[PDB]
Amino acid sequence: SWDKDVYPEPPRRTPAPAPQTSLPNPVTYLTKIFDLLVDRPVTLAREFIEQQHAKNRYYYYHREFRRVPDITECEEKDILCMFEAEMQWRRDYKVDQEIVNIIQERLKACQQREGESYRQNCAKELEQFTQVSKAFQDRYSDLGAHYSARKCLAKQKQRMLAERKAAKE
């Protein structure tokens, strides 16, 4: 259902069972019992409810907002343009937060999945999260509780001035 590109899950590698002891594995019998007595009725109920849903098939859409002139392209006291730009900035802020969340989910899933080899098998995920963290922190940090698009603009301008000074040295 979800985008495997967004949520990368490495192809599963389950080893083949090769019993070397005559004793019957209790797990196999228990799993068969669980399947028959639980999965089957649960699946039947799911099928019935899915039929009911298929009958009443309706769709919900995703609202998309057009791009609006940023606070950079906005007059000093033009409250209308400022409101538009600030709302756009807040929307982008939320989107960036959700991007950070997605990468974090990737990292946690990698930590659990790779088990004891997590340190060596999650380098890519750690690097991705580090990049996203750095970017998000540089863009949005220390703005304060009363954050605003003007505050991010001021922080970016200060950063750019510092970059200019460093490059000039």
Binding site: I71, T72, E73, C74, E75, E76, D142, L143, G144, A145, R150, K151, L153, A154, K155, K157, Q158
Partner: peptide
Amino acid sequence: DKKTYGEILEEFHPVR
């Protein structure tokens, strides 16, 4: 003169 925010410079005061 009406100048846009991209042109003016407002000092950023970090909240730490």
